[PDB]
Ligand SMILES: CO[C@H](C(=O)O)c1c(C)nc2ccc(Br)cc2c1-c1ccc(Cl)cc1
């Protein structure tokens with residue numbers, strides 16, 4: 001539905017740890033990472049990874065103060081990203097999926113990536129049938145032509 005370069009990034013906490021979660025809005029495609037806590041440095045770093053892989057043009061968050069450090073503003077500068085001073089939830093969705101897999105993995109780390117994998121792969125409710133992972137790549141290839 002939305003612009004191909006729009007992404008959302010937020011932190012959740014689970015087991016005393018921080019999971020950083022990026023959602024490509026138009027597809028539902030998630031990428032995630034477990035960090036020991038929220039620091040500008042971790043946020044910048046994660047943006048740098050995301051941007052070297054997708055065309056990121058704008059990043060929205062539900063917590064703006066997340067993006068106030070020089071550190072974060074530099075990553076966004078260097079990579080050509082912008083936010084927006086204003087404005088789901090999958091975050092319900094991802095945790096849920098985490099909850100089903102937790103026993104299968106020793107470290108939250110692993111269980112999260114398992115949950116990310118299940119989410120990106122799941123077949124669209126019915127018709128169409130594309131998974132979040134298939135749609136991201138469709139949107140981005142389609143928007144290249
Ligand atoms: C992400 O960690 C950085 C690093 O390893 O050098 C870092 C770090 C850790 N601190 C910074 C403080 C001010 C400014 Br401007 C940039 C940074 C930077 C920084 C260096 C390069 C880029 Cl593209 C973005 C940020």
Ligand SMILES: [As]
Pocket residue numbers: 009010011020038043066
């Ligand atoms: As965050």
Ligand SMILES: [As]
Pocket residue numbers: 059067072073076081082083
């Ligand atoms: As930014």
